[PDB]
Amino acid sequence: MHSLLIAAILGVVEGLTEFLPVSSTGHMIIVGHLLGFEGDTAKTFEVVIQLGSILAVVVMFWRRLFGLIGIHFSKGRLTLIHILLGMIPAVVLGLLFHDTIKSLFNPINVMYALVVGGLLLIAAECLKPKEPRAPGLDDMTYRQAFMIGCFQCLALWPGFSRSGATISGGMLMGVSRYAASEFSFLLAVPMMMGATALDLYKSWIPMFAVGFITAFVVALIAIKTFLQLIKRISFIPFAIYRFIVAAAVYVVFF
Ligand SMILES: CCCCCCCC/C=C\CCCCCCCC(=O)OC[C@H](O)CO
Ligand SMILES: [Hg+2]
């Protein structure tokens, strides 16, 4: 009776922490450990429900995503070249270091990426310019998009919260918190869709239906609130929250 309940608990977690700088992978290992869902099947299940979070960004940015690829229906406009430049370096670094990255998945490394990721969010807050260089999404430049991407190499460290890494570099390149968040979401669509496909390949029954779907729903609510929320809130509360999670990763496993 609780196979569906566990998937609901894991789904609301994944959908919530996927696009918030709070280390989706870190929350899953602690909750999966507290529940007892730790087998290889759990990891496969977790990659599946990541697809639901993807579709949430797909439906949230349906008009803009297809716009980048030519399916329409400041005066600049964000182009597909921005997305490509944002994902070139992580792909190149991710392809070359696959066996090495997969070795970093122990919980101790998550504890550090939780702390170090929070330090970076603080440094982005203290160091970001007073006047944003790109207050809107369509104001971004190829240099900002690429520097954000070369900054996404850190997300290959398990527990770093790819959103937190991507948004930090956005703020440090002069992109507003709102646009830096919008770009991290749009950038996650090609990244997650390809990465999960890459993970679904090497890993091979209705428990997915609950998890995939409920993660799609919660992500929509979180991703819509967070964008409206971040208009008036900083990333300091998120960075400090990652420290409380880091102690928990130590608490649950050590
Ligand atoms: C009192 C309740 C909270 C208890 C936990 C205390 C947090 C201390 C932990 C780590 C250091 C964090 C460094 C402090 C963050 C920077 C403070 C700040 O003012 O940020 C600058 C601003 O965001 C841009 O101008
Ligand atoms: Hg890089």
> Residue ranges of the domains in the chain?
1-254
Closest ligand 1 atom to 126 CA: 24
Ligand positioned closest to the Cα atom of 123: 1
- Shortest CA distance to 26 belongs to which of 148, 113, 147? 113
Buried/exposed 107-131: b ≥16 CB within 10 Å, e otherwise: bebbbbbbbebbebbbebbeebeee
Look at ligand 1, atom 11, and give the residue with the nearest C-alpha. 240
> What span, in angstroms and rounded, lies between the C-alpha atoms of 101 and 217?
30
